[PDB]
Amino acid sequence: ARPCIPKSFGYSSVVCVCNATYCDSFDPPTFPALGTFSRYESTRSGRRMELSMGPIQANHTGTGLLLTLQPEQKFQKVKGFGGAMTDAAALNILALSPPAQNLLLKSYFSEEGIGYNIIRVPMASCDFSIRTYTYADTPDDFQLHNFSLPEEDTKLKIPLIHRALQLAQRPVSLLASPWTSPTWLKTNGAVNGKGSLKGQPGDIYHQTWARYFVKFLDAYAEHKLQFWAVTAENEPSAGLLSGYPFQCLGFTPEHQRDFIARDLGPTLANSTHHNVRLLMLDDQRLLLPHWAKVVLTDPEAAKYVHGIAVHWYLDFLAPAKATLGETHRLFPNTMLFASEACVGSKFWEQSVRLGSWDRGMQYSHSIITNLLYHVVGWTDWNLALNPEGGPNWVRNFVDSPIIVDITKDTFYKQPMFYHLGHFSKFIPEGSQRVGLVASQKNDLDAVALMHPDGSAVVVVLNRSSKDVPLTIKDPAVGFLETISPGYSIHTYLWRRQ
Amino acid sequence: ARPCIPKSFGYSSVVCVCNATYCDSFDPPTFPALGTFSRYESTRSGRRMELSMGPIQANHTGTGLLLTLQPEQKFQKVKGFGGAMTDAAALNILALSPPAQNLLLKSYFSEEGIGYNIIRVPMASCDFSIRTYTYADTPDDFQLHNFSLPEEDTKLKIPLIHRALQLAQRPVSLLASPWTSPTWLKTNGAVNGKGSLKGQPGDIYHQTWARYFVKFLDAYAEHKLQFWAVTAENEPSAGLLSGYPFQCLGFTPEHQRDFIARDLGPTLANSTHHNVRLLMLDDQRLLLPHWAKVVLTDPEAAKYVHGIAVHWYLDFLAPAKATLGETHRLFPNTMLFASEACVGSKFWEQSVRLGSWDRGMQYSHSIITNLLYHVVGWTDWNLALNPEGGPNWVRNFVDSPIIVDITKDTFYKQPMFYHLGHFSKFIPEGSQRVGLVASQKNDLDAVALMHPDGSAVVVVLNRSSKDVPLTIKDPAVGFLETISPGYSIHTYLWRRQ
Numbered sequence: 001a002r003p004c005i006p007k008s009f010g011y012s013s014v015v016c017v018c019n020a021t022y023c024d025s026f027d028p029p030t031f032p033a034l035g036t037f038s039r040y041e042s043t044r045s046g047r048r049m050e051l052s053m054g055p056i057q058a059n060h061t062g063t064g065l066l067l068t069l070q071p072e073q074k075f076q077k078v079k080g081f082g083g084a085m086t087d088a089a090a091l092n093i094l095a096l097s098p099p100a101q102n103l104l105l106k107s108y109f110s111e112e113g114i115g116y117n118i119i120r121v122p123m124a125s126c127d128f129s130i131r132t133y134t135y136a137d138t139p140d141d142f143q144l145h146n147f148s149l150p151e152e153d154t155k156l157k158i159p160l161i162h163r164a165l166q167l168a169q170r171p172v173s174l175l176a177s178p179w180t181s182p183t184w185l186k187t188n189g190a191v192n193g194k195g196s197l198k199g200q201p202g203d204i205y206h207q208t209w210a211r212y213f214v215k216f217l218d219a220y221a222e223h224k225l226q227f228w229a230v231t232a233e234n235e236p237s238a239g240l241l242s243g244y245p246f247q248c249l250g251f252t253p254e255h256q257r258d259f260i261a262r263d264l265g266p267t268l269a270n271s272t273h274h275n276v277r278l279l280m281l282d283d284q285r286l287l288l289p290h291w292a293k294v295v296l297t298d299p300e301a302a303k304y305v306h307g308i309a310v311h312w313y314l315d316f317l318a319p320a321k322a323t324l325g326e327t328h329r330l331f332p333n334t335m336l337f338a339s340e341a342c343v344g345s346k347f348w349e350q351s352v353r354l355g356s357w358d359r360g361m362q363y364s365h366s367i368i369t370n371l372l373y374h375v376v377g378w379t380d381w382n383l384a385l386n387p388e389g390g391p392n393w394v395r396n397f398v399d400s401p402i403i404v405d406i407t408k409d410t411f412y413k414q415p416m417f418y419h420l421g422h423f424s425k426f427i428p429e430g431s432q433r434v435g436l437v438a439s440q441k442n443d444l445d446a447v448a449l450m451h452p453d454g455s456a457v458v459v460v461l462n463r464s465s466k467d468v469p470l471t472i473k474d475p476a477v478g479f480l481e482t483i484s485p486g487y488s489i490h491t492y493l494w495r496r497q
Numbered sequence: 498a499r500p501c502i503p504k505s506f507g508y509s510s511v512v513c514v515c516n517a518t519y520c521d522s523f524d525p526p527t528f529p530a531l532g533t534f535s536r537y538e539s540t541r542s543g544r545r546m547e548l549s550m551g552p553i554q555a556n557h558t559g560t561g562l563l564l565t566l567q568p569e570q571k572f573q574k575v576k577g578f579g580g581a582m583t584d585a586a587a588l589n590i591l592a593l594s595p596p597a598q599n600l601l602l603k604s605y606f607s608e609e610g611i612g613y614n615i616i617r618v619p620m621a622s623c624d625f626s627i628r629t630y631t632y633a634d635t636p637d638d639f640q641l642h643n644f645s646l647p648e649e650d651t652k653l654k655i656p657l658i659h660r661a662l663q664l665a666q667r668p669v670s671l672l673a674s675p676w677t678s679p680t681w682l683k684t685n686g687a688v689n690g691k692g693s694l695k696g697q698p699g700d701i702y703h704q705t706w707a708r709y710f711v712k713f714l715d716a717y718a719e720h721k722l723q724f725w726a727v728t729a730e731n732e733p734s735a736g737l738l739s740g741y742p743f744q745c746l747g748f749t750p751e752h753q754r755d756f757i758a759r760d761l762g763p764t765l766a767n768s769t770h771h772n773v774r775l776l777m778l779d780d781q782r783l784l785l786p787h788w789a790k791v792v793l794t795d796p797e798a799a800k801y802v803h804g805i806a807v808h809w810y811l812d813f814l815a816p817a818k819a820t821l822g823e824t825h826r827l828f829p830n831t832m833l834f835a836s837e838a839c840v841g842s843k844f845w846e847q848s849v850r851l852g853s854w855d856r857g858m859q860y861s862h863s864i865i866t867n868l869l870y871h872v873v874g875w876t877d878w879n880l881a882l883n884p885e886g887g888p889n890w891v892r893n894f895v896d897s898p899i900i901v902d903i904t905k906d907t908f909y910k911q912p913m914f915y916h917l918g919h920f921s922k923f924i925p926e927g928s929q930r931v932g933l934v935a936s937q938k939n940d941l942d943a944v945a946l947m948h949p950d951g952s953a954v955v956v957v958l959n960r961s962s963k964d965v966p967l968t969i970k971d972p973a974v975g976f977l978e979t980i981s982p983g984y985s986i987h988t989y990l991w992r993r994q
């Protein structure tokens with residue numbers, strides 16, 4: 001292992017500094033012996049997924065907080081965790097020296113790092129691009145004869161995705177999302193602003209747009225990349241808004257229902273890509289359960305929809321129980337998946353706060369809340385940005401777990417990296433959320449899961465300043481006596497057999 | 498009477514220029530005889546509530562669009578229309594010479610103007626203030642011995658409100674809303690940011706905050722002003738958001754429920770202000786019907802709640818049927834009221850676009866949609882702003898139907914003013930929405946109401962470029978043959994007996 005080289009930028013915690021020759025890393029992952037637990041600890045004070053071990057004991061006495069595992073009580077199975085290979089992320093990563101690039105990719109995708117198994121891939125340009133383009137800009141090409149991947153794909157995104165997949169031990173799932181169609185398919189004839197596809201579902205405009213998804217998947221398959229899933233549209237509600245500043249395509253839930261039933265579903269289903277999953281919504285969770293009711297009560301749309309993708313940006317408006325909870329209750333066989341999150345997109349939010357513990361706690365608090373309300377995965381936005389939070393053609397600068405400093409051939413791993421890693425590293429695909437009952441009222445955020453192989457993982461987040469002694473009971477194995485320090489996050493793992 | 502002096506600022510339409518000696522106005526109503534209708538027409542081309550009259554026919558033949566009044570299909574009674582007397586609006590109005598001031602107030606409040614009958618009054622400071630203050634900034638003053646109105650109230654707002662009332666021939670209803678409590682009642686000790694009242698409903702903090710509402714109403718009563726209603730908090734969800742940039746006070750729906758049941762409801766009820774109405778939510782309509790269910794299913798909260806106030810800012814997310822419609826279905830005896838709207842609060846929106854027809858159409862489309870889904874009133878934000886869209890201590894600049902140019906002792910009446918006046922002038926308190934059906938699919942927004950005197954009022958908005966020839970049928974009087982020009986709004990009046 002190599003420890004965090006800390007650096008303060010005057011925010012509440014430190015970044016870890018990496019460069020061509022040095023990056024913090026883990027030893028190969030193993031379980032300790034039966035009767036022993038592993039603890040990984042990060043703290044605002046500067047600990048970064050530090051490994052310690054403790055005994056699992058037969059007995060426990062006291063009035064202190066007890067968290068009892070309910071291994072029998074089974075909820076959702078996890079798909080995974082990861083981040084977005086935008087044009088901006090690819091430009092920032094490739095601006096590093098080759099050896100610094102490999103340390104950045106290993107930080108995310110290897111077992112020496114935090115084991116990402118999801119990459120979100122924009123279908124052509126978004127705000128996190130320096131050029132506005134689609135795959136089919138030649139006007140009125142309804143045959144899509146002039147469809148092609150430009151260098152942003154063939155020289156930047158695709159070679160980096162190959163390198164991430166070569167570094168991973170667990171299979172990586174690619175998820176594709178479009179921001180805009182070609183402008184000649186749009187009511188407003190622009191990549192941005194208030195605008196939808198022309199005409200109506202089932203017509204030439206909608207058939208062309210559905211065929212564009214197949215052409216994209218065909219083009220990535222020529223480069224030997226296969227997709228796990230696509231979303232029906234990034235933030236379809238954005239294209240309903242006067243003056244929307246960057247690439248968008250407006251759908252009402254009824255429009256999305258009919259597009260999916262008539263065009264996108266059947267076009268994917270009758271293609272070599274019929275196994276690729278389709279996720280609906282890809283938008284704020286306040287739109288649930290309404291959007292789920294509109295699309296999924298139509299059996300002709302419902303038969304094509306695998307999952308519901310959610311964005312975190314207005315989660316303050318949207319209590320988990322009334323949105324995620326109610327959607328699961330109504331449509332329990334349709335998975336919920338968190339497809340995009342970043343801090344810094346609000347006008348008052350500073351783009352980049354190097355070393356922000358607050359932004360780390362926002363990430364882990366969101367992931368825990370999502371996992372407690374049936375969500376099967378959580379996806380970061382840009383994998384890497386510059387110290388400005390760009391590049392971004394409309395200056396919609398945001399924060400990222402890794403900030404590249406090209407003048408120093410350096411990258412900074414922020415608290416958000418470690419907060420996400422406390423989940424991504426220790427919750428492999430197929431892990432099943434299980435119950436975890438508190439003996440009393442407490443200020444902690446916690447979730448428990450069981451690995452496919454039967455091992456236990458518990459994540460404990462303390463967003464308070466107060467240390468909280470606690471015990472974890474596994475009814476078949478015993479008791480973990482521990483503490484949750486103020487401004488900490490812990491991941492606990494142990495064999496059950 | 499006195500026509501628009503048009504000026505173009507290079508946007509889609511003209512503003513009407515007013516100064517110390519000249520402002521556009523109306524003549525008194527002539528009440529045309531049975532068999533004649535009145536038409537008020539505004540157009541992007543520059544017509545400003547121009548009056549024409551036409552015949553009503555016994556008969557109609559054709560395949561053209563027919564709108565049929567259903568006078569026996571009766572819905573909500575209207576409370577009214579108006580705007581907000583913020584510190585910013587008061588400073589802008591008082592920056593004019595006294596003659597220009599009275600022409601501005603006459604524009605809004607007189608029968609020679611557009612007959613406003615609602616004024617929303619911030620309870621102490623908001624973003625549209627040049628300094629941050631509450632009425633009780635002396636620390637830990639739980640007795641509220643040091644509660645007092647500053648000069649923003651006693652020298653600016655209160656005298657201007659008295660002047661508006663005197664110019665109005667219609668009874669004016671005052672609506673009060675707080676943004677923040679004293680910081681010493683808050684978890685975060687700041688006017689802004691993520692923070693709620695300390696403790697829990699029914700405690701000293703919540704009792705003091707409820708008493709502050711009574712002290713506010715007592716102080717305004719010392720100045721000879723009485724309120725129609727208060728809201729429980731301006732945008733309570735804002736206080737739940739990290740770094741929220743201006744005055745706020747966070748409540749979850751459960752917190753608002755328990756605050757109303759235990760503190761605000763009983764405190765107002767046991768005061769000389771027991772007749773003042775209490776409106777809940779005062780927030781984005783996407784929070785409906787959830788907030789209505791959380792608050793109104795508690796009988797101890799429900800007995801104090803007159804109505805639900807909604808803001809328009811995230812209407813693009815929130816279909817009227819799924820929000821206002823469902824809330825009306827579930828809680829038909831709890832009135833819905835639109836308490837705040839402005840254009841320019843989104844980061845990509847230019848603060849002020851002098852003469853924007855687009856912003857005018859946003860207002861009338863919102864008012865018509867609200868009226869078609871049971872809403873009893875519609876309230877603008879700042880009554881007036883400067884050309885920068887301020888002043889505003891956090892530079893959250895926005896647009897206003899009247900813009901004051903202090904350097905020229907001039908104010909500009911924008912399309913938003915006329916689009917609102919198409920409703921406010923012709924739909925007094927007690928008007929009842931009635932049924933209006935179309936013979937075919939159309940691009941028009943239309944609503945029919947019956948004046949208390951029994952006369953008909955129909956507003957027709959055309960947001961398309963295409964002239965639409967139209968017939969209106971009133972089964973009591975016969976047929977109006979008319980045309981809805983592209984980018985027009987019309988109000989139609991006629992006697993029914």
Ligand SMILES: *[C@@H]1O[C@H](CO)[C@@H](O[C@@H]2O[C@H](CO)[C@@H](O[C@@H]3O[C@H](CO)[C@@H](O)[C@H](O)[C@@H]3O)[C@H](O)[C@H]2NC(C)=O)[C@H](O)[C@H]1NC(C)=O
Nearest residue numbers: 002003004005006017018019020021022023097408409410
């Ligand atoms: C890439 O980053 C690594 C890690 O920061 C850089 O290595 C480090 O270089 C500095 C300056 O030479 C070393 O500082 C020194 O520490 C010794 C005691 O260990 C102290 O006596 C000196 O006064 C000084 O503070 C640091 O030890 C060293 N760290 C490691 C782990 O090698 C490296 O230079 C960077 N590479 C490039 C190409 O910029």
Ligand SMILES: *[C@@H]1O[C@H](CO)[C@@H](O[C@@H]2O[C@H](CO)[C@@H](O[C@@H]3O[C@H](CO)[C@@H](O)[C@H](O)[C@@H]3O)[C@H](O)[C@H]2NC(C)=O)[C@H](O)[C@H]1NC(C)=O
Nearest residue numbers: 499500501502503514515516517518519520521905906907
């Ligand atoms: C307040 O606004 C009104 C309306 O714009 C201003 O009135 C306008 O004033 C100009 C300058 O006096 C008038 O122009 C003159 O018209 C006469 C013919 O009547 C002509 O002989 C002169 O050569 C000159 O063009 C204009 O007619 C008048 N408009 C109206 C509608 O009254 C007024 O000046 C403004 N006052 C202040 C203090 O800003």
Ligand SMILES: *[C@@H]1O[C@H](CO)[C@@H](O[C@@H]2O[C@H](CO)[C@@H](O)[C@H](O)[C@H]2NC(C)=O)[C@H](O)[C@H]1NC(C)=O
Nearest residue numbers: 553554555556557558559970972973974975976
């Ligand atoms: C004008 O409208 C009146 C009212 O409907 C028409 O009169 C009636 O015509 C219908 C259909 O032909 C008859 O069934 C009714 O019995 C008539 N009612 C009355 C009260 O007379 C009239 O025909 C129309 N005039 C024209 C020129 O088309």
Ligand SMILES: *[C@@H]1O[C@H](CO)[C@@H](O)[C@H](O)[C@H]1NC(C)=O
Nearest residue numbers: 137138139141144145146147
């Ligand atoms: C579009 O594709 C056709 C057929 O492959 C080709 O001949 C034509 O030149 C292309 N047009 C452009 C603008 O590239």
Ligand SMILES: *[C@@H]1O[C@H](CO)[C@@H](O)[C@H](O)[C@H]1NC(C)=O
Nearest residue numbers: 634635636638641642643644
């Ligand atoms: C608060 O009110 C009390 C009682 O009227 C008074 O004695 C005291 O001076 C006031 N304090 C301030 C700071 O105004």
Ligand SMILES: O[C@H]1[C@H](O)[C@@H](F)C=C[C@@H]1O
Nearest residue numbers: 126127234235345396398
């Ligand atoms: O394109 C992204 C944007 O960069 C981020 F700010 C939020 C939502 C959008 O999907």
Ligand SMILES: O[C@H]1[C@H](O)[C@@H](F)C=C[C@@H]1O
Nearest residue numbers: 039041052482483484485
């Ligand atoms: O750093 C400590 C941790 O805070 C506590 F929970 C137990 C063991 C670790 O060494």
Ligand SMILES: O[C@H]1[C@H](O)[C@@H](F)C=C[C@@H]1O
Nearest residue numbers: 623624731732842893895
């Ligand atoms: O205070 C107002 C603000 O001025 C406006 F931008 C929108 C919402 C708030 O209530």
Ligand SMILES: O[C@H]1[C@H](O)[C@@H](F)C=C[C@@H]1O
Nearest residue numbers: 536538549979980981982
């Ligand atoms: O300006 C016109 C209007 O457009 C039409 F509806 C009828 C009468 C008016 O003169």
Ligand SMILES: [Ca+2]
Nearest residue numbers: 732808810842
């Ligand atoms: Ca707002």
Ligand code: NA
Nearest residue numbers: 390391392393
């Ligand atoms: Na840039």
